[PDB]
Structure 1
């Protein structure tokens, strides 16, 4: 409801954040399971689904 009120009657309804959400699907929805970085590996295994 907060989002709806904030963006009620946007370009049509949102038309913008419905676009940036698709980009936000990054760091996510990829065959990669654990992001390695040097000797530090952050594993999104439990949250992936």
Structure 2
């Protein structure tokens, strides 16, 4: 409801944030299960689903 009130009657209804949500699906929705960086590996395995 907060989002609806903030963006009530946007370009049409939102038309903007619904666009960046698909981009925010990044760092996510990939066959990659754990992000490696040097010797530090962060495994987003329990939350992936």
1:5-47 deviation line (CA, Å, top 9, x unaligned) = 0000000000000000000000000000000000000000000
What CA distance in whole angstroms lies between the structure 2 residues aligned with 1:39 and 1:31?
Answer: 21
**Cα RMSD over matched residues?**
0.2
What CA distance in whole angstroms lies between the structure 2 residues aligned with 1:6 and 1:20?
Answer: 16
| Structure 1: gaps spanning 5 or more residues | none
State the aligned residue count.
49
| Structure 2: gaps spanning 5 or more residues | none
Moved segments of 4+, more than 4 Å: none
Q: Secondary structure at the match of 2:32?
A: coil
